[PDB]
């Protein structure tokens, strides 16, 4: 179990003004710290956020949070479930800002909701320093889905935060799971009327203005004022980052296909949709060609690293926990039989036999 701690700074809040927080399971004598960013889509206007508040309220409020959570996958403390960092200090940061961890806006007179995702991360790091993070040697900022994109948006700010607070020895690194999306065209066009089927570009363009979202500085300097939505897309923001970032992404990510208005029905796949799915797989594969630390299996799925069976998937015979361990060694010339760049080359969902079954 990880134990809940609500933030002492109650100005840093979830959407509805309730205090944000984090779940912590300490490991004394370990200088490794894993801070995981939960995912869970987003909402980019009052109408959609109101709907999210009656039926997905735990993603917008801490009022009903349990006082403990069980660590799973990379957050598990059992070596059997987590061969990678089973002995690390475990932190699970709940996603309650609906802003892809980008917001820096307080609830106010003029704002019905607070979007403080970027400030929640900064405040968690600040309050953890008094609980042992000051003695850390590696801080791995991880996250899945919207949390994976949040890693790309915030990993360098965490590094700059610790540097300015006087902790230059803490190595900040990023692990982005299932947050590497493409601003491609939809298979069938919709007008952006709701969340899940809104095209990627239009959803973020509306969200960043609604949340007062912040992006990494160097990426902001490239795309400049009004075009900061570009920095939510991994292949554009990754080359501007300086912290080492390991990228985990299914080649045929289900959330990517959802915003692309692709609904795989079990029905026969016609030529047009077959070419679309195969071309989507190529575009990931191409966008990851120059990403030295990456794990990209050819599967139709979504999220990996906190699933209890995340150890099962392999690319070229290497599991993700092994690839991450190889990444650790590389950050001490390639290593003999311990690879870090693992991108499937086969063109169709589940051509890798180790893909998740969905059972
Ligand atoms: C489920 C989720 O969290 N998704 C899916 C679409 C998406 C997410 C997160 C960040 C971004 Cl940036 C995008 C986008 F479509 F805009 F690419
Ligand atoms: C609480 O957080 C806000 C926003 O990050 C900051 O401006 C303020 O100084 C913090 N309060 C304390 C007491 O640290």
mmCIF file of C-alpha atoms and ligand atoms in Angstrom, residues 39-42 100 145-147 149 178-179 181-183 198-201 203-204 232-233 253 255-256 259 302, ligand 1:
data_model
loop_
_atom_site.group_PDB
_atom_site.id
_atom_site.type_symbol
_atom_site.label_atom_id
_atom_site.label_comp_id
_atom_site.label_asym_id
_atom_site.label_seq_id
_atom_site.Cartn_x
_atom_site.Cartn_y
_atom_site.Cartn_z
ATOM 1 C CA UNK A 39 -3.846 9.443 -16.732
ATOM 2 C CA UNK A 40 -7.506 9.784 -17.589
ATOM 3 C CA UNK A 41 -8.232 11.921 -20.682
ATOM 4 C CA UNK A 42 -9.067 15.614 -20.001
ATOM 5 C CA UNK A 100 -2.847 16.732 -19.220
ATOM 6 C CA UNK A 145 -1.702 8.052 -21.098
ATOM 7 C CA UNK A 146 -2.357 11.719 -20.186
ATOM 8 C CA UNK A 147 0.222 11.167 -17.453
ATOM 9 C CA UNK A 149 2.187 13.321 -21.985
ATOM 10 C CA UNK A 178 1.217 5.815 -23.914
ATOM 11 C CA UNK A 179 1.470 9.608 -24.150
ATOM 12 C CA UNK A 181 0.425 10.895 -29.911
ATOM 13 C CA UNK A 182 0.239 11.991 -33.541
ATOM 14 C CA UNK A 183 -1.590 15.060 -34.833
ATOM 15 C CA UNK A 198 -12.341 15.387 -30.997
ATOM 16 C CA UNK A 199 -9.365 15.556 -33.339
ATOM 17 C CA UNK A 200 -6.028 15.747 -31.466
ATOM 18 C CA UNK A 201 -5.055 19.248 -32.639
ATOM 19 C CA UNK A 203 -8.750 19.279 -28.471
ATOM 20 C CA UNK A 204 -5.362 20.584 -27.328
ATOM 21 C CA UNK A 232 1.707 18.379 -26.326
ATOM 22 C CA UNK A 233 2.811 16.035 -29.133
ATOM 23 C CA UNK A 253 -2.574 2.823 -29.435
ATOM 24 C CA UNK A 255 -6.628 6.119 -27.497
ATOM 25 C CA UNK A 256 -4.910 7.335 -30.672
ATOM 26 C CA UNK A 259 -9.442 10.334 -31.366
ATOM 27 C CA UNK A 302 -3.383 1.359 -24.191
HETATM 28 C C1 LIG B 1 -6.538 9.107 -23.257
HETATM 29 C C2 LIG B 1 -5.604 10.308 -23.329
HETATM 30 O O1 LIG B 1 -5.128 10.755 -22.341
HETATM 31 N N1 LIG B 1 -5.312 10.893 -24.623
HETATM 32 C C3 LIG B 1 -5.833 10.422 -25.892
HETATM 33 C C4 LIG B 1 -5.635 11.564 -26.847
HETATM 34 C C5 LIG B 1 -4.575 12.466 -26.212
HETATM 35 C C6 LIG B 1 -4.411 12.051 -24.888
HETATM 36 C C7 LIG B 1 -3.486 12.695 -24.045
HETATM 37 C C8 LIG B 1 -2.734 13.758 -24.528
HETATM 38 C C9 LIG B 1 -2.899 14.182 -25.852
HETATM 39 CL CL1 LIG B 1 -1.920 15.549 -26.446
HETATM 40 C C10 LIG B 1 -3.810 13.550 -26.703
HETATM 41 C C11 LIG B 1 -3.924 14.084 -28.137
HETATM 42 F F1 LIG B 1 -4.973 13.556 -28.831
HETATM 43 F F2 LIG B 1 -4.091 15.436 -28.080
HETATM 44 F F3 LIG B 1 -2.773 13.821 -28.815
#
